[PDB]
Design a protein around this ligand. Sequence first.
Ligand SMILES: O=c1ccn([C@H]2C[C@H](O)[C@@H](COP(=O)(O)O)O2)c(=O)[nH]1
Ligand SMILES: O=c1ccn([C@H]2C[C@H](O)[C@@H](COP(=O)(O)O)O2)c(=O)[nH]1
Lengths: 316, 316
Amino acid sequence: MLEQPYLDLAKKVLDEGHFKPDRTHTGTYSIFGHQMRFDLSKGFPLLTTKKVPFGLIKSELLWFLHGDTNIRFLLQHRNHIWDEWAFEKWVKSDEYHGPDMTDFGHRSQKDPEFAAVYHEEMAKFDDRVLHDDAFAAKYGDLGLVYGSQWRAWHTSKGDTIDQLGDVIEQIKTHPYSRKLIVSAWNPEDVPTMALPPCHTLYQFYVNDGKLSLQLYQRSADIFLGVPFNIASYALLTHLVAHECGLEVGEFIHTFGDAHLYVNHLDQIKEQLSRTPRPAPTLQLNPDKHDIFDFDMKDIKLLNYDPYPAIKAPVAV
Amino acid sequence: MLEQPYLDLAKKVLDEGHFKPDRTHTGTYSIFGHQMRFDLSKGFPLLTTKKVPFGLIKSELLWFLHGDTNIRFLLQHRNHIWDEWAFEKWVKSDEYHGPDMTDFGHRSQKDPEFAAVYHEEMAKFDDRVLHDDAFAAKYGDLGLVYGSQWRAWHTSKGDTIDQLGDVIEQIKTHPYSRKLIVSAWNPEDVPTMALPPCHTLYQFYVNDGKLSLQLYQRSADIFLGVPFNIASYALLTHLVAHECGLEVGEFIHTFGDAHLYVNHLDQIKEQLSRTPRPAPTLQLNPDKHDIFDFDMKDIKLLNYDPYPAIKAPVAV
Ligand SMILES: O=c1ccn([C@H]2C[C@H](O)[C@@H](COP(=O)(O)O)O2)c(=O)[nH]1
Ligand SMILES: O=c1ccn([C@H]2C[C@H](O)[C@@H](COP(=O)(O)O)O2)c(=O)[nH]1
């Protein structure tokens, strides 16, 4: 089945992943260097052996495509995937005067009541960003996140480069170019960042009128991370193909440190006992072609029939 | 045998590589996305089914390590791998007053006498760079080449970052870091360059006291390119391991566009009829550990017994 490569990665890490301690002191089982491919002509690689929220995937991707860096957009779509990042700044600001939120991420993980005051402050923060424009401009803007890296790479000369916009043009004028590359890694910024890009670099490739894309992910959470990562980039591959009038080829996913956190083993084992169902089909707006001017309604997933979702503790 | 992955790549591209035209109008057979690994504890991956000049590999690598960008160093070691690049500038300079060298690369490929006047001017150019310090400073310096990218990444703030020097430190203080990454791709520079980095990015990884390195090569010449590329990075893996006091793991080589130029098929087929011999063993100076202060004498290849070399026309 289409998603089999993912299940095969989960197995391999269980069988031969060496224990390797990580920064979160949680513990992991990892392997270095792995690659899997998905034939996008066979279907959309959104897992069926477990329910994945495609809505969070499409919204976040469009957010990236717009060159947006402000969370406000996301909250407007109920997408909270990045809140933790903006909320941190607020908490550590001189304007922040409320309950000490030190190590709130896992502190909430170890306190039902702390998580109460914490989920309270968070709910407030999200409200301000949603309504108070000046507050949003100050705390809702992540700054250095995929959107600016893809669409507004700051140059020494003081300008900004639209990597993605330029590459799409190159695909339209030199499809056989061996350097349709977009980077998210900037040695200048990487040192001072909290979490340097996990999706370090990706490359397009065209042949026989088909578009393929290879992604280099330096670090990966097999259980919680990967199911999403696959959907984000397979979707990007479709959008760019659509915009360039090409057929879709395959999404090649290359890994650096693929890992399983020790606290996801029972969950991963369970999923492995499930049998993949046919993959869903993706459908994009035929009339509209400028992918940068796309919105939710322009992308629809069909025939997605997953198994129930699988809950598991995030490693914080 | 140790080099089997390479032979397996050659086969695969012959069997299922789709014809794909390239910028040199030569013609190629390519595949997108491939990965092979070499267990460095089993030997050094310098091909035995064909003779490869390790001297050119060690000198060029040290050149990179020194953060050097001036060809002068290379010529001092009889290494001419980069001449073509510096020679071009000279030819197109206002100080250059001699035979028109337009498209000299392949123009020489189609004229025994042009190649004569051309090899004459080149021999002169190399002499000036070797003796005339001022000329070298002007034409012998490539500027944006691996050495400066690895060891002196120019920042907007006006500084220069030593990626490699910093990463080696991180390996010594946080070996389990999932971001021991060095990039050679700069969106700001890539557009105006003649040949953007083929070796786009590489990543270190440590576990069980062993160092592994994964390389992302966006484009590759299976026949003339790869045999060298493998040696350069397997050697870098050894040097860094040596400097950090770790054992050696494996070199994982990831590819974007792996290709065979149409004019190398008879040669590749011939090599495929050869049977790999045991791999050579690498030996580094035990007393000296600061790899940036290394020189030829500090690295020796043992028991390398290849088959005769295989001549083939370079795609220019
Ligand atoms: O889309 C994402 C984002 C993050 N990660 C994971 C990788 C690691 O589990 C953690 C980042 O820790 P470091 O790799 O930076 O050390 O987040 C993913 O797999 N997918
Ligand atoms: O160390 C090297 C340097 C170059 N190439 C090859 C790849 C392509 O054959 C050509 C570069 O052409 P473009 O890929 O940039 O389009 O050089 C290699 O395989 N190895």
